[PDB]
Design a protein around this ligand. Structure first.
Ligand SMILES: O=C(NO)[C@]12CC[C@H](CC1)C2
Lengths: 300, 237
């Protein structure tokens, strides 16, 4: 179990750690988060009490280094940093724990939610979508745009998700125009899975990362990406059986975890009604269809 | 964006454009089978691809053999239309290729867009106009070549005859949509007015009678009366 200490909390802020969150008052004696489960990526995220504009946060994996948070009064945000002095860090953390100034990552033992949401998400793949190679952790916020969004303006601060576009030469084989547009299996299996992602685990990892950035930061380009990757599978007549079974599980836990009050902006009606009711895979997402129908029948 | 009443003069500027109408591509008669079920029998169709500025009409004849053994024909017909329009553009010299293709039905947008991916600079546009091009098979010289076809074939026409020697393309297109709207609302009575005078002949190399400017302004009025009538005869007004 690992720890992310905070130097201090000089401004009132709601702090999230994965799906949990807590309020910290201005200059409240808060020194971090302990008992973070090893084996998963994590996200620590922030919303200032004064400026609900810009949710922002940091993807990290405590196996890759010792990380801590420190407020920067010039740039006006909580920044993640790496502590390279291992003994300084252990000593800092042990003092804060002794004084009990840390919140405990509040995982219930039966609860597999975070595993289920991050099953295929790897830090190494996050760092290729979020390019900032001098850090082991990745910053994301509500306003960052995607590479594909920039094609339709600062590249260093982009989300470099795999571009999917159903009306493109990559997606459509010359002479198979109708076949490939109505049955996207070629584009899914040959172009994306065999060509770009190499396997379905990497595909699912980007899909899950896109959902999590959409949910936690309201990142609109991430929401677009999550829906496109769903739609590309459901609009393929030919999908490995193991992928369809895993997709139903993945989406089930995403819909389960989504705040009820955010469904209006975060779920695209067309994609979901097409996927659950019109597409080739309309009959292959039983768990997802049942939770959607009991939790968001309005959308459908 | 969409083509409508407000940007109507754009049709007659000097940017090459084509209208594509797919209505008459997939044509069937519906009939009873010996067992009392219903079946369709396809007949020859055509793609109606028209330059509204010049009157040049590329009439691609769709022979019934193209449907043999195929499923979901109404959907295939749209993709076949797009394939044939795309092949037509590729066959034209670059300086004759259109800068816009306007489709008369919105369901043609994605099929044409996908077939024209190689031509990213050609705009594929819908329209809000209710254009009467389905009535092109009322013209016996066009209907006759479609029905006689024994294989796929492209036949080139000028749908304005020699009108552009005397009128503008705006006026010519207005006359055409008036002749066609009248043929589409009441084919018989329109023909009986159009051919009322048997001394006014349809030349061998023309589709319409050899009307002078004074009959042409008139008959347009007769194209008006019929359409308002049928609109009363329909709504009772
Ligand atoms: O059939 C025709 N030409 O081939 C006509 C010409 C005027 C009437 C309307 C269309 C008859």
């Amino acid at each position: 179990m690992n720890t992310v200490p905070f130097t201090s909390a000089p401004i009132e802020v709601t702090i999230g750690i994965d799906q949990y969150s807590f309020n910290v008052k201005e200059n409240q004696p808060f020194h971090g988060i302990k008992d973070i489960p090893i084996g998963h990526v994590h996200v620590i995220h922030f919303q200032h009490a004064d400026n609900s504009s810009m949710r922002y946060g940091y993807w990290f994996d405590c196996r890759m280094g010792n990380f801590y948070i420190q407020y920067d009064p010039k740039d006006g945000l909580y920044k993640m940093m790496e502590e390279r002095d291992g003994a300084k860090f252990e000593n800092i953390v042990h003092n804060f724990k002794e004084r009990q100034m840390m919140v405990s990552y509040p995982k219930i033992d039966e609860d597999d939610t975070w595993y289920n949401l991050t099953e295929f998400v790897q830090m190494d793949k996050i760092r290729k979508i979020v390019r900032k190679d001098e850090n082991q952790f990745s910053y994301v916020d509500s306003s960052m745009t995607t590479v594909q969004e920039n094609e339709l303006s600062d590249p260093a601060h982009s989300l470099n998700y795999t571009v999917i576009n159903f009306k493109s030469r990559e997606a459509i084989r010359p002479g198979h125009e109708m076949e490939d547009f109505l049955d996207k299996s070629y584009y899914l299996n040959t172009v994306m899975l065999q060509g770009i992602f190499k396997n379905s685990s990497n595909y699912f990892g980007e899909l899950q990362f896109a959902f999590l950035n959409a949910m936690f930061f309201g990142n609109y380009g991430s929401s677009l990406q999550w829906h496109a990757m769903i739609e590309l599978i459901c609009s393929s007549a030919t999908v490995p059986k193991h992928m369809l079974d895993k997709l139903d599980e993945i989406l089930y836990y995403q819909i389960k975890t989504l705040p009820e009050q955010y469904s209006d902006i975060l779920l695209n009606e067309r994609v979901w009604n097409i996927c659950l009711y019109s597409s080739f895979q309309k009959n292959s997402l039983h768990n997802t269809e049942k939770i959607m129908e009991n939790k968001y029948p309005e959308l459908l | 964006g969409a083509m409508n009443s407000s940007n109507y003069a754009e049709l007659f500027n000097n940017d090459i454009k084509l209208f594509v109408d797919d209505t008459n591509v997939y044509r069937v008669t519906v009939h009873k089978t010996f067992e009392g079920n219903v079946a369709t029998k396809a007949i020859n169709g055509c793609i109606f691809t028209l330059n509204p500025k010049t009157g040049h009409l590329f009439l691609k004849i769709i022979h019934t053999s193209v449907w043999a053994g195929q499923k979901r024909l109404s959907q295939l017909a749209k993709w076949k239309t797009a394939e044939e329009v795309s092949a037509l553009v590729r066959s034209l010299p670059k300086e004759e290729q259109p800068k816009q293709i306007i489709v008369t039905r919105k369901a043609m947008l994605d099929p044409l867009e996908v077939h024209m991916l190689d031509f990213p600079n050609i705009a594929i546009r819908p329209t809000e106009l209710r254009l009467p091009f389905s009535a092109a098979m009322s013209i016996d010289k066009l209907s006759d070549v479609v029905m006689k076809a024994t294989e796929p074939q492209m036949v080139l026409f000028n749908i304005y005859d020699d009108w552009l020697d005397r009128i503008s393309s705006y006026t010519a297109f207005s006359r055409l949509t008036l002749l066609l709207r009248a043929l589409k609302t009441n084919e018989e009575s329109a023909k009986m007015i159009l051919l009322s005078d048997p001394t006014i002949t349809i030349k061998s190399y023309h589709l319409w009678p050899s009307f002078t400017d004074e009959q042409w302004i008139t008959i347009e009025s007769q194209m008006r009366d019929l359409i308002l009538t049928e609109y009363g005869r329909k709504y009772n007004v």
